[PDB]
Enzyme design. Structure first.
Site, PDB file in Angstrom:
ATOM      1  N   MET A  96       0.715  11.702  11.783  1.00  0.00           N
ATOM      2  CA  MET A  96       0.218  10.334  11.797  1.00  0.00           C
ATOM      3  C   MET A  96       1.155   9.461  12.618  1.00  0.00           C
ATOM      4  O   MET A  96       2.371   9.465  12.393  1.00  0.00           O
ATOM      5  CB  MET A  96       0.098   9.779  10.376  1.00  0.00           C
ATOM      6  N   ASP A  97       0.593   8.714  13.564  1.00  0.00           N
ATOM      7  CA  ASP A  97       1.378   7.762  14.339  1.00  0.00           C
ATOM      8  C   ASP A  97       1.562   6.484  13.520  1.00  0.00           C
ATOM      9  O   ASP A  97       1.320   6.453  12.311  1.00  0.00           O
ATOM     10  CB  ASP A  97       0.731   7.511  15.701  1.00  0.00           C
ATOM     11  N   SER A  98       2.012   5.413  14.174  1.00  0.00           N
ATOM     12  CA  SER A  98       2.288   4.170  13.459  1.00  0.00           C
ATOM     13  C   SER A  98       1.042   3.642  12.759  1.00  0.00           C
ATOM     14  O   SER A  98       1.087   3.277  11.580  1.00  0.00           O
ATOM     15  CB  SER A  98       2.839   3.122  14.426  1.00  0.00           C
TER      16      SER A  98
ATOM     17  N   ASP B 190      -1.971   5.237  12.133  1.00  0.00           N
ATOM     18  CA  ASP B 190      -2.596   6.156  11.184  1.00  0.00           C
ATOM     19  C   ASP B 190      -1.886   6.125   9.838  1.00  0.00           C
ATOM     20  O   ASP B 190      -2.531   6.188   8.785  1.00  0.00           O
ATOM     21  CB  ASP B 190      -2.602   7.579  11.741  1.00  0.00           C
ATOM     22  N   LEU B 191      -0.555   6.041   9.855  1.00  0.00           N
ATOM     23  CA  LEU B 191       0.205   6.021   8.610  1.00  0.00           C
ATOM     24  C   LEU B 191      -0.163   4.816   7.758  1.00  0.00           C
ATOM     25  O   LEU B 191      -0.335   4.937   6.540  1.00  0.00           O
ATOM     26  CB  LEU B 191       1.701   6.023   8.915  1.00  0.00           C
TER      27      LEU B 191
END
Ligand code: CDL
Ligand code: CDL
Ligand code: CDL
Ligand code: 3PE
Ligand code: 3PE
Ligand code: PLC
Ligand code: PLC
Ligand code: PLC
Ligand code: PLC
Ligand code: PLC
Lengths: 183, 353, 105, 80, 192, 149, 78, 95, 161
Positions: free
Chosen positions: H41-43, H45-46
């Site tokens: 997960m990128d920024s 998505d998290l």
């Protein structure tokens, strides 16, 4: 007092419907062993007009009938039938004498009472003429017991409370006696 | 026909008497709306309605007919229960209060020894019907107005009830007709001038009239509880509010100005001596005369309702609560002790006769 | 002794006398037991509810049914509507069946 | 229907709805007192009926104040 | 039980106060100063604040004196009431009661006095006030009316006892004494 | 400068009261007088020639129980609740035309039908427990058993 | 007296909002009024059933007691 | 009433299902499972996952914790320690 | 047709299906009105008017409290009931309206006989006041004491200060 009871006509027919009231008659006469007596046939206004003359004429019989009731000790309506018949005849005698001696004066007074909510204070003038006529012909004086003779309300010269509406017949009949009797 | 036609009128006569009674009250209420604008107009140096009907006599008719020809606003056709139940409770309450008003001696639809209680009890139901409009409503101005109606009710209800009880105590009766006839030699305006002011102040608060118009304050709550009401529900509430103004004006004339009693006993006898008492025309004139005395006194207080609206600014309701509970209540409860003490001292305790 | 059974006009009502005779019997010093005052208790309770008298009317109505007697031939005539207490029913000489006035006395 | 306690379904699901049930239940006692007093022509029963009405109104106010303060306790932060 | 002579089953308020003994006034004073004194004693027993004695404020002593003043009178009122009831020794009160009644009877005046109340209200007032002193500790109620239900027979005032010959009161029959029941219903049996 | 236009609505309001009073005072008084003329329609409506002037009876107010007994007593004499008669003797039919109202003595419908108001420990006992009615039936049975003695 | 004024208002609004619930409630109301008016006896017989099952003195029970006394008294004379 | 009824196994189980509805590299999620590495997960998505896990458990991550969260187990620890049932009306409890 | 039976039939239906607190404050008013009318038309007109004078003031105070405590809970909630179970319940209830089992007391009609001895004729409220202020004056003075306690009680409960 307009309280609903089980002894007379109530305020409206919705009261009868809720109570399922039956207005019941009885076709049987009084038993033949009891002596008959003719009932008093006068209505409310004539009776109130004649109330103080029935009192001044039947005082002995009225008291004797009431004293019979006290001595009956619960057996009232049976033991005072004979005394009651005397009261009815004496009261009818007064009404009979009114219609033969003071007919116009008497009918004037209770026609004013019917015109004036049956309040004695509204019909002083017709009452004064009737009192004068009765006293001359029957020797009956209206007296209110318990008070001095000169403090009787029906003889008050300047009453505080007076009828708003004037009975025209009483005004005319009062003027006629003023100019002919008290010269 | 003939006989059947003639005694059918006897079978319907009392219904026409009620229809004439209803018609008479609605005429005063209809033309009070016209009279208020005419009275305010000239006090404000304008004219008021004079273009709807000859000299403005049809302005009340136009307002009712126009509002009765308007669409009713509600979420659904079956949602009539919401904004119609309230107006009907308010209207039925004030109209039923007129059953005990006597236009003459014995000329009241209801006569009883508890007519005073019926009068107070009937009007209290109208207060309930007003608050029903804010029935979990999403209109915040209707909701804000419902809170103020309760606050005003608490203010005036104690004072108005206690004042009428003092008048009933002086005559020792709760029959309205007996109270009127008890004022033959004196009008209760003279012995109870403070109570007449308090009764009128309470009447202004009860009817939500200015300076106590905190419920329908246009500058504060657009229309108060009426902001969502249109067409028929608005007429009924408007009709009932002006019916209450006529009722409280007539009660001011009954409790303190002798009701239907003539202004002059000499003039009253002079006028009635022209007509033979053996003719039905005497009783028509007497009915006009006695109601005219009541009409004149009630017209002055209906004028006074309009008069105070055109002279005084509005008072906040939280100040009205303090005024009624800290000033009016202590004074009225003082007189409820004052009056029996005076009468006992002079051996003049009242009785019914 | 506080007042009980006060009529609507301030005096004794219909059943006060029955109650008064019960109190006098129960509080009399000549009585060894409360047996003498038992009939007085039933009389007072009969004055209020008339339960035994209603029970007697139940028997008379039922006994008349089983012998085929007509209720309208052995009972008492009655009128249910106050407007029709007419002068013909009342028996007046010039009586009529027209309704009487009950709207305003 | 009474013995299976059908009245328990007619009472609403708020604390105020319990208050209304109590008022209705007490009002049943007063109607029974008025009915008996009128039939007997007894003013002592009507004095009792008047006392019940005044007293029943007193507990209605006392109970309301408890419920009023109970709701205030929940709305206690009042940072405004 | 050490019972005594019954003087008045429902003594009037004025009679109870007038018949106070000097000790009854003494106890009235003790009640009046006993309430401020107990406030000092309670502070002496245990100080209200901290551990040192502090005189209670004057406003507390003012309300305490008022509470004691009413309490002292209620005690004295019940002390004098017992003598009228016969529960307490009342030899002095009997002699004073007999002199006052015989004096009033000789004047053809009611020993009880004339009342503004009608026959019902005199009877009703006696029903409300008789024996009410038994609850004077809870709430007050006094006999401030001239009723005739005092639980005594006025014929006992027509026998001269020891120490009453020098009074020389000539007592008329009871039907000539004004405002008494036995001399009131002359014309009607239901009106006085 | 009295503005007459502003006083017009008050004149109509004044006439509004006078309409009610003029009708009510005359219509009611006439009907009471009409029904007091006699016991049938031919006397109430028609006016005899030998009769005198019509005397009117005004509506009654501030009544009590005596006025209710009077009203029924007047009805038994004249067929009207405000009939007029000063005859010293009544008709024969007055001796047997007494009216006696007979009514039930049941509890109000709201007491015995309201879903909540009808529930109480004593109401359930009166309705579902036969303990009370068993005892009171013994009293009624003694009345018939004791007739023979 | 206020139910006489309100009843037309409540009844029509009750049918408008809930026509089926109103018709069922009103239909049952009329049916029992027909039972009482036309002497169908349905409500009376239910009442006679409740008293019999709950041990109350029924109308027949009180009449049986009278008949038992009647036969007892007649033999006492004969 | 006003107390948590949460167990570590239920919170983990509900966390896994809410994380399974996303586009993660692996469906095998346990406490040690990291967001950046294991799930990927990128920024953005998290933070979509955190808010999704907020709605499931009716909890709100503080800013300090949310920026510093690494593993799935840290979320389960946070929910268990901070979860409170929402206050009910004055009638829900006493009636 | 006794139309009060229909009124109570509708009221019992609405008490079973009532959901929110506003409907309950309407069940109260829908109960006092049948009581007031039936007292007015059958037994006591005095107490029909006393009910209206006192209960209405209590109703509005009750209504204003609903505004301050309404808490969103029962507008969006769901109820199940069932139309068939409601009407069947009301049918079974309507079957038994005999609160008393004395058949003779419920069926046999009675009358009272009037007498003319009461010539001083006044209202029931004058006799009630005559007794309440003379013989049961203690009851009145205790009631005054209880009303005073409520005034102090309401302040010590509600007032934050
Ligand atoms: C008398 C004056 C008085 O009551 O004391 C002054 C007292 C103190 O007033 P203040 O100027 O505020 O004194 C400042 C300190 O707070 C006051 O501090 P304080 O401690 O000096 O006053 C407290 C007071 C306590 O005062 C009371 O207890 C009031 C008693 C009334 C009950 O304690 C006393 O001093 C007792 C003696 C005075 C009261 C005697 C009452 C006898 C019974 C009658 O004023 C009142 O209490 C007035 C209350 C009564 C108002 C009138 C009620 C009218 C009722 C009848 C109306 C129809 C006629
Ligand atoms: C939880 C709630 C509980 C309830 C709590 C509420 C508390 C209620 C209890 C209060 C009392 C209950 C009774 C209330 C009903 C009163 C109605 C009534 O009695 O009217 C009849 C009564 C008149 O009827 P009456 O048969 O002709 O009796 C004449 C005298 O009252 C009687 O003859 P007299 O020998 O007394 O002569 C009068 C004259 C006597 O003055 C003289 O001429 C000298 C004779 C010797 C007197 C020297 C000692 C005086 C003591 C200082 O001056 C007085 O003694 C005034 C009497 C009042 C004394 C103070 C009252 C104590 C209240 C504490 O009306 C009154 O004037 C009663 C006195 C004033 C009312 C007191 C109000 C207290 C509050
Ligand atoms: C009657 C008393 C008035 C009088 O004698 O005749 C004047 C009055 C006509 O007023 P006006 O001829 O314009 O006055 C002469 C100058 O124009 C008036 O010229 P001005 O405006 O220069 O005079 C001023 C005068 C105002 O004019 C007045 O004098 C009116 C008097 C007002 C007090 C009495 C009302 O004085 C005042 O301003 C006093 C006003 C302050 C008093 C405030 C109220 C205190 C209570 O004649 C009538 O009385 C009959 C007309 C009234 C209407 C009748 C039909 C009403 C329609 C109902 C429907 C059918
Ligand atoms: C306390 C003072 C009571 C004494 C008083 O001032 O009035 C008493 C007086 C009774 O005396 P009297 O006039 O002789 O009555 C005739 C009896 N046949 O006449 C009276 O009874 C008048 C009534 C006294 C009430 C005074 C006010 C009461 C105080 C309320 C607080
Ligand atoms: C002038 C007439 C005024 C009344 C006309 C309107 C008729 C509607 C019912 C009036 C009273 C009948 C009994 C109702 C008791 C209260 C129960 C109630 O909740 O009100 C019923 C009303 C209908 O809502 P509904 O959609 O049908 O049901 C909810 C569906 N989820 O739900 C509502 O909340 C609407 C209520 C509006 C405010 C009514 C306030 C009560 C007024 C009662 C005055 C009359 C006394 C009762 C007389 C009839 C007795 C049955
Ligand atoms: C109330 C009785 C007085 C009527 C007033 C009037 O007849 O009013 C006149 C009317 C209305 O027209 P307008 O423009 O409002 O008149 C106002 C004139 N201004 C503008 C100068 C003020 O004109 C008409 O004749 C048209 C309608 C035909 C007659 C029917 C009138 C309505 C009858 C209903 C009431 C009886
Ligand atoms: C205050 C002003 C009104 C006022 O003073 O009104 C009272 C006075 C005086 O009438 P009264 O003595 O109360 O009795 C009323 C007597 N009548 C019946 C003759 C009016 O009425 C007027 O003079 C008008
Ligand atoms: C014993 C004899 C009783 C007298 C009977 C009358 C009692 C009246 C009491 C008034 C007191 C008052 O106006 O009170 C004022 C209060 C609060 O004012 P406040 O905040 O205290 O400031 C004032 C205090 N000062 C000045 C000492 C600082 O509110 C008001 O402005 C109320 C305004 C009411 C106006 C209603 C119009 C009615 C018109 C009537 C036309 C017929
Ligand atoms: C003789 C006639 C005149 C007597 C006047 C006496 C006043 C006493 C007073 O006011 O007493 C003073 C006290 C306390 O004063 P405060 O305002 O609290 O503070 C004092 C001022 N400071 C802030 C500077 C310290 O007030 C009270 O207890 C008021 C009680 C009055 C209640 C009245 C209710 C209405 C009843 C009316 C009849 C039905
Ligand atoms: C007074 C008078 O003479 O009454 C005549 C009347 C009405 O007159 P008004 O001025 O409208 O009465 C209104 C009363 N005010 C002015 C006090 C508000 O008029 C006719 O019906 C003729």
């Amino acid at each position: 007092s307009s309280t609903h009871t089980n002894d007379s006509l109530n305020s409206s027919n919705y009261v009868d419907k809720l109570k399922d009231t039956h207005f019941v008659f009885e076709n049987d006469k009084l038993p033949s062993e009891i002596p008959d007596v003719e009932e008093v046939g006068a209505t409310t206004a004539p009776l109130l007009s004649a109330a103080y003359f029935i009192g001044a004429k039947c005082q002995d019989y009225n008291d004797d009938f009431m004293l019979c009731q006290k001595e009956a000790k619960g057996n009232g309506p049976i033991d005072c039938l004979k005394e009651g018949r005397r009261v009815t005849r004496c009261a009818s005698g007064v009404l009979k004498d009114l219609n033969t001696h003071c007919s116009d004066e008497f009918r004037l007074h209770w026609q004013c009472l019917s015109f004036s909510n049956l309040e004695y204070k509204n019909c002083r003038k017709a009452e004064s003429l009737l009192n004068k006529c009765v006293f001359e012909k029957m020797n009956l004086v209206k007296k209110i017991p318990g008070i001095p003779e000169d403090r009787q309300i029906h003889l008050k010269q300047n009453p505080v409370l007076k009828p708003v509406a004037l009975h025209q017949d009483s005004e005319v009949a009062f003027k006629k006696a003023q100019n002919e009797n008290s010269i | 026909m003939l006989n059947n036609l003639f005694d059918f009128i006897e079978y319907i006569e009392y219904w026409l008497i009620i229809v004439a009674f209803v018609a008479s009250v609605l005429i005063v209420v209809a033309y009070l709306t016209v009279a208020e604008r005419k009275t305010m107009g000239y006090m404000q140096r304008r004219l008021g309605p004079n273009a709807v009907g000859y000299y403005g006599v049809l302005m009340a008719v136009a307002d009712a007919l126009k509002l009765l020809s308007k669409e009713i606003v509600l979420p659904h056709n079956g949602d009539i229960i919401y904004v119609m139940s309230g107006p009907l409770i308010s209207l039925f309450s004030v109209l039923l209060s007129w059953a005990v008003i006597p236009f003459g001696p014995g000329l009241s639809l209801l006569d009883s020894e508890y007519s005073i209680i019926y009068l107070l009890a009937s009007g209290s139901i109208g207060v309930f019907g007003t608050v029903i409009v804010g029935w979990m409503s999403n209109s915040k101005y209707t909701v804000l107005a419902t809170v103020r109606t309760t606050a005003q009710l608490i203010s005036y209800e104690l004072v108005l009830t206690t004042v009428v009880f003092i008048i009933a105590l002086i005559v020792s009766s709760l029959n309205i007709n007996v109270i009127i006839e008890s004022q033959y030699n004196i009008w209760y305006i003279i012995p109870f001038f403070p109570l007449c002011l308090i009764f009128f102040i309470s009447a202004l608060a009860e009817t939500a009239r200015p300076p106590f118009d905190n419920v329908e304050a246009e500058s504060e709550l657009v229309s108060g509880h009426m902001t969502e009401l249109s067409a028929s529900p608005f007429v009924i509430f408007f009709l009932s509010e002006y019916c209450s103004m006529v009722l409280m004006s007539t009660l001011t004339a009954i409790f303190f100005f002798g009701g239907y009693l003539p202004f002059s006993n000499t003039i009253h006898h002079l006028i009635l001596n022209l007509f033979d008492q053996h003719s039905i025309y005497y009783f028509i004139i007497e009915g006009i005369l006695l109601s005219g005395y009541l009409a004149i006194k009630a017209n002055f207080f209906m004028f006074s309702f309009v008069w105070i609206r055109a002279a005084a600014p509005r008072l906040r309701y939280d100040l009205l609560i303090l005024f009624c509970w800290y000033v009016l209540l202590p004074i009225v409860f003082a007189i409820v002790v004052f009056a029996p003490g005076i009468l006992y001292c002079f051996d003049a305790l009242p009785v019914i006769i | 002794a506080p007042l009980q059974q006060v009529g609507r006009h301030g005096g004794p009502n219909k059943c006060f006398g029955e109650f008064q005779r019960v109190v006098e019997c129960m509080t009399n010093a000549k009585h060894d037991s409360y047996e003498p005052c038992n009939n007085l208790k039933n009389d007072y309770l009969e004055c209020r509810k008339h339960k035994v008298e209603r029970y007697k009317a139940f028997l008379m109505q039922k006994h008349a049914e089983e012998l085929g007697k007509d209720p309208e031939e052995i009972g008492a005539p009655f009128v249910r509507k106050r407007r029709f207490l007419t002068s013909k029913t009342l028996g007046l000489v010039d009586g009529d069946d027209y309704e009487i006035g009950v709207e305003k006395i | 229907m009474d013995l299976i306690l059908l009245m328990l379904v007619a009472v609403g699901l708020n604390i105020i709805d319990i208050y209304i049930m109590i008022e209705i239940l007490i009002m049943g006692c007063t109607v029974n007192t008025i009915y008996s007093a009128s039939l007997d022509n007894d003013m002592i029963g009507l004095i009792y009926s008047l006392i019940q009405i005044i007293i029943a109104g007193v507990e209605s106010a006392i109970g309301l104040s408890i419920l009023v303060n109970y709701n205030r306790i929940r709305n206690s932060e009042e940072i405004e | 039980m050490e019972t005594y002579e019954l003087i008045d089953s429902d003594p009037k308020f004025s009679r109870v106060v007038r018949y106070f003994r000097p000790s009854d006034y003494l106890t009235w004073a003790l009640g009046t100063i006993g309430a401020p004194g107990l406030m000092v004693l309670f502070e002496k027993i245990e100080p209200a604040k901290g551990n040192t004695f502090k005189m209670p404020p004057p406003s507390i002593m003012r309300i305490a004196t008022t509470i004691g003043f009413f309490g002292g009178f209620y005690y004295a009122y019940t002390s004098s009431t017992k003598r009228f009831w016969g529960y307490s020794e009342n030899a002095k009160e009997v002699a004073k009661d007999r002199y006052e009644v015989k004096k009033a009877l000789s004047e053809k005046k009611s020993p009880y006095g004339s009342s503004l109340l009608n026959p019902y209200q005199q009877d009703m007032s006696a029903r409300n006030s008789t024996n009410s002193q038994l609850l004077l500790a809870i709430f007050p109620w006094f006999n401030v009316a001239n009723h005739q239900s005092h639980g005594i027979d006025l014929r006992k005032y027509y026998e001269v006892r020891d120490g009453e010959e020098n009074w020389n009161f000539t007592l008329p029959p009871l039907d000539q004494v004004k405002d008494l029941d036995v001399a009131q219903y002359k014309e009607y049996s239901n009106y006085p | 400068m009295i503005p007459f236009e502003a006083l017009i609505p008050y004149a109509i309001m004044f006439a509004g009261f006078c309409l009610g009073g003029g009708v009510m005072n005359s219509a009611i008084t006439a009907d009471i007088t009409k029904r007091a003329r006699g016991p049938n329609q031919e006397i109430k409506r028609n006016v005899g020639e030998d009769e005198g002037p019509r005397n009117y009876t005004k509506p009654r107010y501030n009544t009590d129980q005596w006025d209710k007994y009077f009203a029924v007593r007047d009805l038994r004499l004249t067929g009207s609740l405000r009939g007029q008669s000063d005859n010293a003797v009544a008709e024969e039919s007055f001796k047997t035309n007494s009216i006696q109202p007979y009514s039930n003595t049941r509890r109000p419908w709201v007491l015995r039908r309201h879903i909540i108001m009808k529930n109480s420990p004593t109401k359930w006992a009166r309705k579902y427990s036969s303990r009370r009615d068993e005892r009171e039936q013994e009293i009624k049975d003694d009345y018939i058993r004791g007739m023979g003695e | 007296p206020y139910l006489v004024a309100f009843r037309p208002a409540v009844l029509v609004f009750f049918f408008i909002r809930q026509p089926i619930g109103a018709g069922l409630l009103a239909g049952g109301f009329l049916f029992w009024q027909a039972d009482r008016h036309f002497n169908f006896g349905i409500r009376d017989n239910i009442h006679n059933f409740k008293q019999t099952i709950l041990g109350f003195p029924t109308q027949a029970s009180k009449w049986e007691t009278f008949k038992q006394v009647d036969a007892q008294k007649r033999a006492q004379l004969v | 009433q006003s107390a948590s009824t949460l167990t570590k196994e239920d919170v983990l189980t509900r966390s896994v299902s809410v994380l399974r509805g996303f586009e993660v590299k692996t469906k095998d999620i346990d406490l040690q499972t990291t967001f950046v590495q294991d799930l990927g997960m990128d920024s953005l998505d998290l933070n979509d996952a955190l808010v999704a896990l907020e709605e499931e458990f009716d909890v709100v991550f503080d800013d300090k914790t949310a920026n510093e969260i690494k593993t799935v187990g840290e979320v389960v620890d946070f929910v268990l320690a901070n979860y409170l049932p929402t206050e009910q009306s004055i009638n829900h409890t006493i009636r | 047709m006794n139309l009060e039976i229909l009124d109570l039939s509708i009221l019992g239906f609405y008490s079973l299906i009532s959901s929110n607190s506003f409907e309950s404050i309407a069940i109260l008013v829908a109960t006092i009105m049948p009581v007031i009318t039936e007292l007015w038309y059958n037994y006591s007109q005095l107490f029909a008017l006393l009910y209206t004078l006192i209960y209405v003031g209590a109703v509005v105070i009750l209504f204003v409290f609903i505004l301050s405590v309404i808490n969103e809970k029962e507008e969006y909630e769901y109820e199940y009931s069932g139309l068939f179970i409601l009407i069947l319940v009301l049918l079974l209830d309507d079957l038994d309206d005999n609160e008393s089992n004395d058949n003779d007391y419920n069926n046999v009609y009675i009358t009272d006989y009037a007498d003319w001895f009461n010539n001083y004729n006044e209202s029931d409220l004058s006799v009630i006041g005559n007794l309440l202020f003379t013989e049961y004056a203690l009851l009145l003075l205790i009631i005054s004491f209880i009303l005073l306690m409520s005034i102090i009680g309401l302040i010590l409960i509600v007032k934050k200060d």
